[PDB]
Amino acid sequence: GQKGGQAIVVHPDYLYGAITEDRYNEYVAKVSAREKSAYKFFHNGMIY
Amino acid sequence: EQFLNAQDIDHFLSMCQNPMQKPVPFVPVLDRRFEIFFKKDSLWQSEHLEAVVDQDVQRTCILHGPVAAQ
């Protein structure tokens, strides 16, 4: 039906150059915590 | 820096129940077996306070008679 489409995805590390060091460090700590909790949820949900 | 795998939580709690071993000196979980975890092996700590959390008698259980205590 003449449905052409294009998307461009850029590496995520180009985002962080637009923020300050303190914001980056706060984000990195928040994401580490969220990953540890997501790992716990994933494995519990998988086995049960 | 990685939390325990659910399978390893189950393994830890299962080996906390090994009959051929001295009961663990802690409560690992709150569940239906909480009374057993709380009360089992409660009399030896009074003669072995070096193995109590703070060498504190007030944590322990001592058997004594109300009238003979006089």
Swiss-Prot record, chain A:
Disulfide feature: none
Record PTM: 4'-phosphopantetheine is transferred from CoA to a specific serine of the Acyl carrier domain by the C-terminal PPT domain. This modification is essential for activity because fatty acids are bound in thioester linkage to the sulfhydryl of the prosthetic group.
Function (record text): Fatty acid synthetase catalyzes the formation of long-chain fatty acids from acetyl-CoA, malonyl-CoA and NADPH. The alpha subunit contains domains for: acyl carrier protein, 3-oxoacyl-[acyl-carrier-protein] reductase, and 3-oxoacyl-[acyl-carrier-protein] synthase. This subunit coordinates the binding of the six beta subunits to the enzyme complex.
Similarity-based family: Belongs to the thiolase-like superfamily. Fungal fatty acid synthetase subunit alpha family.
Subunit composition and interactions: [Alpha(6)beta(6)] hexamers of two multifunctional subunits (alpha and beta).
Note: Present with 17000 molecules/cell in log phase SD medium.
The name this protein goes by in its record: Fatty acid synthase subunit alpha
Lineage: Eukaryota, Fungi, Dikarya, Ascomycota, Saccharomycotina
Gene responsible for this protein: FAS2
Positions spanned in the full protein: 1647 to 1694 of 1887
Swiss-Prot record, chain B:
Protein task: Fatty acid synthetase catalyzes the formation of long-chain fatty acids from acetyl-CoA, malonyl-CoA and NADPH. The beta subunit contains domains for: [acyl-carrier-protein] acetyltransferase and malonyltransferase, S-acyl fatty acid synthase thioesterase, enoyl-[acyl-carrier-protein] reductase, and 3-hydroxypalmitoyl-[acyl-carrier-protein] dehydratase.
Homology family: Belongs to the fungal fatty acid synthetase subunit beta family.
Other information: Present with 91800 molecules/cell in log phase SD medium.
Protein name: Fatty acid synthase subunit beta
Coiled-coil intervals: none
Subunit record text: [Alpha(6)beta(6)] hexamers of two multifunctional subunits (alpha and beta).
Domain of life: Eukaryota
